[PDB]
Amino acid sequence: DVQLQQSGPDLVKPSQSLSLTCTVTGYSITSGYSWHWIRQFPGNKLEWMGYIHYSAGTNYNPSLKSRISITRDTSKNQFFLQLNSVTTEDTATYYCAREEAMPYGNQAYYYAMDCWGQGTTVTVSSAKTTPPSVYPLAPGSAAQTNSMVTLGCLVKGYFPEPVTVTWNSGSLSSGVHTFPAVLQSDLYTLSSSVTVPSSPRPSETVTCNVAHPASSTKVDKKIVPRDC
Amino acid sequence: DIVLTQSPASLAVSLGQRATISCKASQGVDFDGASFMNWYQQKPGQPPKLLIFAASTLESGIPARFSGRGSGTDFTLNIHPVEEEDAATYYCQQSHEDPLTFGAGTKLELKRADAAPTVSIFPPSSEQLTSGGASVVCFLNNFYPKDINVKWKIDGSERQNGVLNSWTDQDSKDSTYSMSSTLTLTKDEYERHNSYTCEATHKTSTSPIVKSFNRA
Amino acid sequence: HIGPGRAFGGG
Numbered sequence: 001d002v003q004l005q006q007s008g009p010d011l012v013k014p015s016q017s018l019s020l021t022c023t024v025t026g027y028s029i030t031s032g033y034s035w036h037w038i039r040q041f042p043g044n045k046l047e048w049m050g051y052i053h054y055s056a057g058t059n060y061n062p063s064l065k066s067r068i069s070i071t072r073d074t075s076k077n078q079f080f081l082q083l084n085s086v087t088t089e090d091t092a093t094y095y096c097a098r099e100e101a102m103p104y105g106n107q108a109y110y111y112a113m114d115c116w117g118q119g120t121t122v123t124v125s126s127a128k129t130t131p132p133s134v135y136p137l138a139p140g141s142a143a144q145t146n147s148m149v150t151l152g153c154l155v156k157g158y159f160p161e162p163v164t165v166t167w168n169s170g171s172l173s174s175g176v177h178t179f180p181a182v183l184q185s186d187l188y189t190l191s192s193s194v195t196v197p198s199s200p201r202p203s204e205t206v207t208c209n210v211a212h213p214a215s216s217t218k219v220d221k222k223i224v225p226r227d228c
Numbered sequence: 229d230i231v232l233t234q235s236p237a238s239l240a241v242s243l244g245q246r247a248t249i250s251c252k253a254s255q256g257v258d259f260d261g262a263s264f265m266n267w268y269q270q271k272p273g274q275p276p277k278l279l280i281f282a283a284s285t286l287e288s289g290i291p292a293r294f295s296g297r298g299s300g301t302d303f304t305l306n307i308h309p310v311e312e313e314d315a316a317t318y319y320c321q322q323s324h325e326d327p328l329t330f331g332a333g334t335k336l337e338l339k340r341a342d343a344a345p346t347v348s349i350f351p352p353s354s355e356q357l358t359s360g361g362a363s364v365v366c367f368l369n370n371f372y373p374k375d376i377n378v379k380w381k382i383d384g385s386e387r388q389n390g391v392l393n394s395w396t397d398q399d400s401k402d403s404t405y406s407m408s409s410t411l412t413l414t415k416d417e418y419e420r421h422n423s424y425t426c427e428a429t430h431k432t433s434t435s436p437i438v439k440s441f442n443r444a
Numbered sequence: 445h446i447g448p449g450r451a452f453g454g455g
Contacts, residue, residue, distance in 0.1 A: 033454060044317060046276070046330040059451040061327040095275055104262065104282050110445040111454075112266055112323065114287070116275040135353035137365055140441055143349075150348040154356075154363055154410070177369060179394040179408040189392060191408045193348070193367045226354075257447075264447045282445075325449015 002026040004096050006120035010214045011160050012090075013126055018083040022096030022117060029072055029079060030054065033111055034099040037070060037081045040119070041092040051099070052079060086124045093119045123160040127186045131215040132158035134208070137191070141226030149201055151223050152193035153208035163212040165192040172196075172206065201225075230254050230322055232331035242339035247307035249334045251320035256300040264324040265303045267296060269316045270333070272397050276319060280305065312338060315398045337374075340403040344432040345371040347439040352418060362418035364411040366426035366439070370404040377429035378409045379436075382421045387411065419443070 008020035022035070029035060036051035050060035052070045060068050064083070072079035083090065097116040104110030137152040155163060165178055172194055181190035192208060200206065207222040235250040257264045263283040268276035280286050280296035283303060295306040307314055317333040345368040352362045368376055374395070380387045390412045395405065409426060425440035446453045 034452065044270075044333060046319065046333075048328045048330065053452040054454070055452065057452060059326050102281055102285070102287070104285050104445060108445060110262060110282050110285070112278060112281040114278050116277075119275055133356075133359065135356045135363070137350045137353065140349070140351060143441065150346070150367060150369065152348075152350065152365070152367060154353070154365060156361075156363065177367070177396060177399075177406045179396055179406070182392045182394050184392055184412075189410060189412075190394075191365055191367075191410060193369065193406075193408070195346075195369065226351075228351075259448050260445065262445050322447075323450070324447040326447075326451050 002115060004098065004115060004117040006094055006096055006117045008094075008120055008122065010121065011123045011125060011129060012086055014087055014124055016086055018081070018086050018090065018122060018124075020081045020094055020096075020120065020122070021078055022080070023078040025077075027098075029074065029077055032098055033101060035072070035079050036097045036099060036113060037094065038097060039092040039094045047092075049081065088124050091122060091124045093121050095119045121161055125160065125186075127159055129214050130157060130159045130187060131217040132156060132163060132188075132210060132212050132219070134210050134219045134221045136208070136221045136223040137193075138223050138226050141228035144225070145198065147198060148195060149198050150193060150195045151201060151206055152191060153210075153221050153223065154189070154191045155210050156189045157187040158212055158215070159187055160214055161188060163188070163190065163210060165190075166209045167192075167194050167206055169207075169209055229327065230257070230324060230329055232320055232322065232329060234320060234331040234334050237332060237334060238337070239334055240337045240339050241310045243312070244309040247305075247310050247314070247336060249305045249318050249320075249336075251298075251303045251305070251331055253301045253303070253322060255324075257322055257324040258299055259324065263299050263303075264322050265296075265298070266321045266323060267305050267318060268321065269318045271316045271400075279318075307336075310336075310338065312400065312403065314338070315400060315403070337398050338403045340372045342432050343370060343372045343404055345369060345376060345407075345428050345430055345437060347426060347428055347437050349424070349426050349439045349441060351424070351441055351443070357415055357418075360415045362413040362415050364413070364418070364424055366409045366411075368407040368409070368428055370399070370402060370406055371430060371432070372404050373431055374405040375431065376405075376407060378407070379427045379429070380409070380411050381423075381425040381427055381440075383423050
């Protein structure tokens, strides 16, 4: 195949520098017409950031000109983005992308941005990295038994985003709902819920797997009936 | 700069319908017989994916269900017929000049038949209580339309303090919406009451949906 | 088939 991978910090204190890396696997940066950088703020607003031509030259969005710089490394085949004097308005998801010749018309090319990386979430804050507290949410133990059961687990008080929740190490895909986090006093709260048939739980239990990469935290809370 | 005004922001189309996203530009965007507009669609948690480019040339791997057209300052994208794996945000974008720019996007939500919220309420985990805090969680799952009104009620009295809610987008499968509502309290405040009610108010019902419990 | 405002072309 051909894939680009953004790599870099999750949390940068304001007034420092952002240095992201985009690793290009299966294509020499040289074979590229141009490699870009784009970021997307909360609310999904997209902003083209700048790029570096195959001729090693660059072009940057004016609004950032003063403090942005895009370079590359032929030998390791990855290009970089550096951004100076980061403020809270620099918190968004960053993506590197490729621009290439696309067959337009007859025997004619047309350049466009066709392959993008996963994106990496960068948080600009002075707050500290906090591991989450994971709490199992088992059905009331009175309001249970009947029909189809809804289970769930609360992930509270962590920073920064993100955190991944899955069930039974990845099995349970259907019936799962994961709600976007919410900030209250600079710590996150998020809850995931899974609706299973009254056949499995209790016997043949479920477990929520929470992984908070910024704090290298991986927690497994096995949901069990309440003794209420 | 060149501004891209997309219309409209919100668009709801039931299955097998016709989706029509416009996208006007501040200056014209043609040149040498090519029109530098493109379209990407982004699904929640995914990178934008290139659909059409150069106004009408569809990118390989894309179902011929999608259509691109327009010239000068006006452009357009249409879906025929709208599928479930078509709920996303579409963004037009110009490669006419640097700096390249994008539009705001258009959330395409698929219409479905009214469905009611399967409410579910949970008391604090015995582990949280030890920790002193006290979260009471209420999931309002798989409903439609997206408009629901949730109200918490302790011993008959309403309570907005400690309440944080969150929503998911359209659920790619059943095209429904879900919601979490969390009431956070101190162990001493939870214990200072009995009845705890989550009360939903939805289009699919006349009387609210209650679901509660009491520390007893 | 690179826009007139693009800083770089390619041929």
